[PDB]
Amino acid sequence: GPVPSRARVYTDVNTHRPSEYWDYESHVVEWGNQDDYQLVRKLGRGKYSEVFEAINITNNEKVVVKILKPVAAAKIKREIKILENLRGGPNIITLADIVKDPVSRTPALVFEHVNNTDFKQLYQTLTDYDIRFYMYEILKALDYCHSMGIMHRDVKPHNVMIDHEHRKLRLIDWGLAEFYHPGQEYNVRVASRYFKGPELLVDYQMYDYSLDMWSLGCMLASMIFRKEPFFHGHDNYDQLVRIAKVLGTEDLYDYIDKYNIELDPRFNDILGRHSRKRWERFVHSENQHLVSPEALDFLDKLLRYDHQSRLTAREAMEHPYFYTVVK
């Protein structure tokens, strides 16, 4: 069967912390006062929650209230425990409170409010300098949560808020986040399609923190090449084909061979044969201002089939791409 895998970094974090740290079921939630928060307007609704802008009436400050749908308690406790563990970490969204919603009778997570810049606006106007600056801010959040034994598993543009005025970044939506435990087989149904790593697409369950570095690479490639999304699959199968047309099929076959993966036979008729395309093939007059040899070198080291061969967040921070960023 498949050969096991473990992260090359932060492998022991959850064993050397007490059991209370990662055993989210045993966690007893301290409940705040729901009347401290007055709902202002509905911001959105996902599959697991309804999101409201609100005012904390005890200090008159804006908050965001995420009222959870009554799906599965295990998921709820995991998100709370991860948010509390990472609280105060660099560029991690602050969980300000947990209350019982009077209407839904379900938990409602209260977060710090981010006056975020419109995402289409960020995509269309961040400069070469800003992409480097904000990518460095994302790496601070990722290295922190990975160092804390947690993988985000849903890194994508909508989960990375920026208040451009105050050059402030927050990594949000920790509902798919998980504790990394060596040898553990995880659900591959995580991350949005365009951001799914090859490990998920080939159904390799023993993945780790390095999944977040692939997703980050997808964000970077889209930004610098001006192609949204960069890997545009019609479904999860075609998603692997889109990747293969860029990275080639030979390295995909080596990856599968290395981990002794049994590739879904559905792939035999659609993968075809492709050779890696040099990154310069994606350069054109409309994206030349965001591309540099350092940007290409950095992207190359994130977008690798082999999850074990990708730069970690800490190594990524040492890359020449960030030398121009004021620290």
Ligand X SMILES: Clc1cc2[nH]cc(Cc3ccc[nH]3)c2cc1Br
Q: Which residues are catalytic?
A: 154
Q: Is 46 annotated as a binding residue?
A: yes
Indicate which of ligand ATP, ligand X, none lies near residue 129 (CB less than 5 to 8 Å, by partner kind): none
Instruction: Please tell me whether residue 129 binds ligand X under the rule CB under 6 A.
Output: no
- By the rule CB under 6 A, 286 interacts with ligand X: no
Q: Of the candidates 15, 33, 38, 43, which one interacts with ligand ATP according to CB under 6 A?
A: 43
Per CB under 6 A, the list member of 7, 13, 54, 64 interacting with ligand ATP is 64
**Region class of 15: left (phi > 0), else alpha (psi between -120 and 50), else beta:** alpha
Distance of CA 237 to the CA centre of its chain: 21
Which amino acid type is present at position 12?
D
173: tokens are 């939506």
Which partner, ligand ATP, ligand X, none, binds residue 123 by CB below 5 to 8 Å per kind? Answer: ligand X
Dist. CA 244–CA 25, nearest whole Å: 40
Which distant-in-sequence residues (6+ apart) come within 8 Å of 259 by Cβ?
A: 2, 3, 5, 204
Q: How would you class 266 by CB atoms within 10 Å of its CB: exposed for 0-12, middle for 13-18, buried for 19 or more?
A: exposed
Residue 93 interface partner, choices ligand X, ligand ATP, none, CB cut-off 5-8 Å depending on type? ligand ATP
User: Is 191 one of the binding residues for ligand ATP (CB under 6 A)?
Assistant: no
C-alpha neighbours within 13 Å on the C-beta side of residue 91: 23
**Based on the number of CB atoms within 10 Å of its own CB, is 268 exposed (0-12), middle (13-18) or buried (19 or more)?**
exposed
Q: Give the separation between CA 168 and CA 251, rounded to whole angstroms.
A: 38
The residue nearest ligand X at its CB is: 157
Single residue of 131, 216, 244, 256 touching ligand X by CB under 6 A: 131
Site stretch for ligand X (CB under 6 A), options 69-77, 90-98, 154-162, 308-316: 154-162
CB under 5 to 8 A by kind: which of ligand ATP, ligand X, none does 64 bind? ligand ATP
- The residues binding ligand ATP (CB under 6 A) are 43-46, 51, 64, 93, 111, 113-114, 116, 158, 172
- The residues binding ligand X (CB under 6 A) are 119, 122-123, 126, 131, 134-135, 157, 160, 162, 219, 222-223, 228
